[PDB]
Amino acid sequence: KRPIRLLPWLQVVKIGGRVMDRGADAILPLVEELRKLLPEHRLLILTGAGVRARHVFSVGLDLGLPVGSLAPLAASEAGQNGHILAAMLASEGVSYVEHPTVADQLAIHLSATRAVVGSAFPPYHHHEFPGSRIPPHRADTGAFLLADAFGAAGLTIVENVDGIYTADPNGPDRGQARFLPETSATDLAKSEGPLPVDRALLDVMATARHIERVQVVNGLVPGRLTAALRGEHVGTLIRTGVRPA
């Protein structure tokens, strides 16, 4: 059998770092939608890194630093994004919590308030896997590892696009990009081109214990996060491979 579900009533939301990079134009509508969601769900909001992590890679790689050194440096940018977002929701009782509090005390903090914010990056730090000079375990991977370990009700990834395409919709081959309403983690893992989610996310999905699907939706369209949290199909659905019992 599977491990038990520690927090079966939890809903986890991951905010893309490059969504935050857009500034108030995107954060304010997002903050308004999250305010209205507070009475409806028990939310753990996790933030990604964004462009600032590409700059530290640019500097770190130029200095020749190993992937174990760049991993935690990029994590800092995701934490700072979480502090910004939590600050905008402080009047509603939301604050940022550290990785130790998420791992061991999430139950008390969601009893004290409706939602909390944290960093989506996992604590792999200087023990990151070797191979690629770019840290593989990034924000998408960290959020799913937590959501599945807790046995949460779901994980929703908020992006700056409608979902996953057959090619980069903002890249050189954007003319051939075809939207994918639904896909499986295994099918994605066998394609070569770029993606909007970490490739490590597909690996941990292959060993997932509880979460059956993850939906990628566009946070730049008000209402889709709300609809996705109710199971409405408004983006790309990724089937992890887990079946019921």
Added chain:
Amino acid sequence: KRPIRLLPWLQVVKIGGRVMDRGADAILPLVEELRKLLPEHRLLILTGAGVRARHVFSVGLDLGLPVGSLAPLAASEAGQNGHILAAMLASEGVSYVEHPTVADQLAIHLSATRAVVGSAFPPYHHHEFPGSRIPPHRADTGAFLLADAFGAAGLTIVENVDGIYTADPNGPDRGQARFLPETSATDLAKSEGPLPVDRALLDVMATARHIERVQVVNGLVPGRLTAALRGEHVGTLIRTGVRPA
């Protein structure tokens, strides 16, 4: 006069380490009974060490380490037992809290949720008293020091036996063991044979400020913890020596 009662509405429960060592057979019925107690009391649950602490003593003593070194090493095992127990109750809003949070912020955390879990070992660490090569201030002592300092409503010790006998009911002289429904800390301190509670517990009881009695009950029988928290006599009562004003 006495010091004031800081938290007069608190009930403290100490779970024996060797109860946790029995595994799911004993933890699951215990977890079910605690779930039903959450709406009835404001609970601080403290866990003991168990057999794993005997193994570190075996290794530490063989290495010749002083009692000040073995004390904190055994404490770690009680903390790990607390993490296991708290994890089973996370869905109900319970989590593990560290010694600093217990000492200084218990009031806020029991306002946020109904109950919390912590380590029963006190922070004597490398300042443990000399004399015996076995650390004297263990889980029973730590739990009573807290309960009495807070002026709690009571302290209940959960064991793997019905109470205190005249001899070890699982030892060589188990044929002569006679159950003791009620006793005083002074009477116990003057006997020589083994006991199911720390001998240091009887010393701190002699200087107790508020708690008048501590009941030792069998956690392997569902319902006795619940009955003991209402003052029902279902185990061994230890009179500390404190009288009313």
Added chain:
Amino acid sequence: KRPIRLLPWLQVVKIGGRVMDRGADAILPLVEELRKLLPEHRLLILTGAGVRARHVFSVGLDLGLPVGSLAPLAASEAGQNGHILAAMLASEGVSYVEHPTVADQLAIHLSATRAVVGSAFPPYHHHEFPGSRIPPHRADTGAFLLADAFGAAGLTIVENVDGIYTADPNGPDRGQARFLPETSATDLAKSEGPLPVDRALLDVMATARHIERVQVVNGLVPGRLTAALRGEHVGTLIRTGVRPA
């Protein structure tokens, strides 16, 4: 425009260190008044240092230590005063919280309970400004910096006197002291004699973003703190210079 108000529903109260130095005669009536205020406001209570900080200055100055060394040493005394006060209110669910929790998680903690206690000293520490051998950024300054950064509803300073006079009412020239029911931070900054509030408080008021007025009231008279929190004029009003929009 101004920065947004992070916690517009917050009320901040600063307790003078020399009020705590008076002992139970002053703390017990104060604790009773705060108990009755808990259901009425969302309170952040901050404590000052007092006479113990003058003693460490006496020793530190005799040792020739710089102002950067004396600043954090005095802060410790304000923290200890906060632990004493919070302990008296633990039965009502109040506890002491550290500077990091105040800066980043005040929203969650005031959702868990009605009020919390903290140190009024700001973390300038060994980066204190040079010039005077006495640390300038003290308890009054730290409390206003927080209250204004949060955009709170107000800040009330609790003293051992009725308010600000034209001279020290307990000093050599107490015969000429004239009570000041209302004044402006700029007017005060241009006078030379002593005051009951930090002179740095007047500087940060000149750059204040939200708080328009701070009232200084006598905590030795039960009821004035309660009246001041409702905007009643029972002490000295200090106009910071901020106007509405």
Added chain:
Amino acid sequence: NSTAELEELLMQRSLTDPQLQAAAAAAADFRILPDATVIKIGGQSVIDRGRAAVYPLVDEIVAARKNHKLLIGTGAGTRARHLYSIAAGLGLPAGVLAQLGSSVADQNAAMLGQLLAKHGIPVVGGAGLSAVPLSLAEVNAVVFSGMPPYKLWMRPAAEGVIPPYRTDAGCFLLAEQFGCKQMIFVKDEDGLYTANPKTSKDATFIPRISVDEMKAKGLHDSILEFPVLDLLQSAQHVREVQVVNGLVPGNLTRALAGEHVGTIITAS
């Protein structure tokens, strides 16, 4: 891959873009601790056995640091296997068990610290950047705990709740990321065999072998945690490892001198 192109890709593309990955693969390579050796002291192999096994190794370490810079990691052992049993019987996930195991390896690191304190060798957090002790002839070595920091974020194995990345992985990845020159696993066996020497009588010793050869022999999970073999093949700095018997007096010292005691496992 010019830097102007790498920086252009780092700002325009997703990190998953193969061209960005390729551009980053051409970056310079810096070794943080190129002159250090990482050593794992086994939990059950050594530390659980008491003074008979720990005291001789403490003496070896004290004498070895005169000529070799050492980062000494600790395993977990018996107490960790008991925690895994309790938690696993309750149905707790791998991430929770991972947190429990760290407590055991931390205990063992503390006990070694009690014994090594009078020799100037501390127990530390952040062994890879413990710059002061690793630059003093009076010290020249530190002790750390062997479990990795994943904790609740531990990646589960394909089946079961036992954390797949434990003290062998924790110590190895430290050596890899800080560009150390040597990785030595100190166990209670002479090295790799064809069959398990504990449970098989006709086992043959293997002095040297590659990861690919081990898997073909069905030896992927024998004397090392099998995920380490894959980490080894992906490593940038530590391309081979050495497993030695810590219960043989002087085995550790002779390995630090370049003698071919034990088994050497090569990435390729």
Added chain:
Amino acid sequence: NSTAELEELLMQRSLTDPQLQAAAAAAADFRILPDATVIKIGGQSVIDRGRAAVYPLVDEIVAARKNHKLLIGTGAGTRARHLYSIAAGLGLPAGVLAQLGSSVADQNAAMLGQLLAKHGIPVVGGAGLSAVPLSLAEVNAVVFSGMPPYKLWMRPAAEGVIPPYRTDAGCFLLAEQFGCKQMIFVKDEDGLYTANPKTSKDATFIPRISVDEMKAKGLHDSILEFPVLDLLQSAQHVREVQVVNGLVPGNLTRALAGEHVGTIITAS
């Protein structure tokens, strides 16, 4: 001001009392680190530029610590300006932006630590009381982050939400409070000019100038953060500062030797 009078005032008067302030001003003066030099390494000036600028300075620092005790602080830079833009656009107060900037300066201090670890130079908190490293010939230097600890208690500027006290103030006040002997700012310009050399062609170099002279020339906010000029005039221990170009190889070393490279700004 006798001590009996000072202690009498410390217990009878308010700390605002001018007589108490005057009595305290006569106290003895103790320097904690009288033989150390504080150095700021610029974020955008240096660290953001990569190996071309960082590696030469790492080499300078490694060689300089043989003869000079150094406390090396780091600036923030590009990533901090991006955070200020995001937060400022949201209307967040200066105290919140101050917390965001510390994260950048901390990152830069870590990256220098990765490079300096093999030389025995650590990244530390509490550089002013890092007694062990600053007393060893094998070390004799430490790295710290440049932002001050004010965080949400940051005093806002007269206008705007940009924290007015940043890495120039953080490094300077550390040198001042611990009574260091020298403060050196390492930028990407040769020093102070009459006009901005980046945006003006007919600028004239200024080798030496006082705070009062800078303000009269309209140069209060040029190569240094202007609040530092006022902190400088109130300083007890560090009464002048020196700004040098870190992109010139050897400039830092020559400044530590007493050569008049760059610009010297005097309190009076």
Added chain:
Amino acid sequence: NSTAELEELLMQRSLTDPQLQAAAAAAADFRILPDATVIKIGGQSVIDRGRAAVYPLVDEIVAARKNHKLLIGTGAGTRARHLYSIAAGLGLPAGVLAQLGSSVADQNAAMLGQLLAKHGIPVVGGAGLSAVPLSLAEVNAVVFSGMPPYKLWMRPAAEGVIPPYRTDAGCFLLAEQFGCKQMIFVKDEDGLYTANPKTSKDATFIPRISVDEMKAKGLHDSILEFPVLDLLQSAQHVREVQVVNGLVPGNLTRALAGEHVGTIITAS
């Protein structure tokens, strides 16, 4: 008591079982810091008195560490007695007062650190395992705070809320558990007398005495905290202590040299 029997008892019996206690009493005895000396610097006796008392002792410590390894603990003093008065008047328990006292002893340890930093002597947590500083001729000493870690778990006295285990107990138990060779209490009196020298004129000096003799003379709570006398009789490593006058220049140094200054209190 063979180990097989000890391990059999450790797994079958309660830790309260006398046979298990007896078996554990036969275990080997390891000293962690056998060559160190623990010294307490009094709060009111010394530190509260200012430069006249602190500066000479700082000089003594700087010169003494050339030949003696030192762990220097600090007392609390005046500010702690004020906190006890405030809290006690409110009816707060001993455990709360214990937390307040630690803050005072920590302050005093910091102030000594400010003065000793330029000499390479740090203020530390975990003095007993501060391996690096205690193995360097440039350092060879550390400073720590004197209060024990019991905090809210402090055992109350028979009567009153004043914590019975304070800085004398904190420093002594550190010396005992780490197997140090010597314990020196630095007060403001020459040593033990028959009557209180402060409040009695016809007092006679006592150079040497046992714990039992002190109690018979009614001197159990005189120059030391009386619970320390009982801790002394139960000690495994530190079987005697020495009380000296810190206001006499050179008294500390002469005690470290073996001169019989002050009073020696023996366990038996």
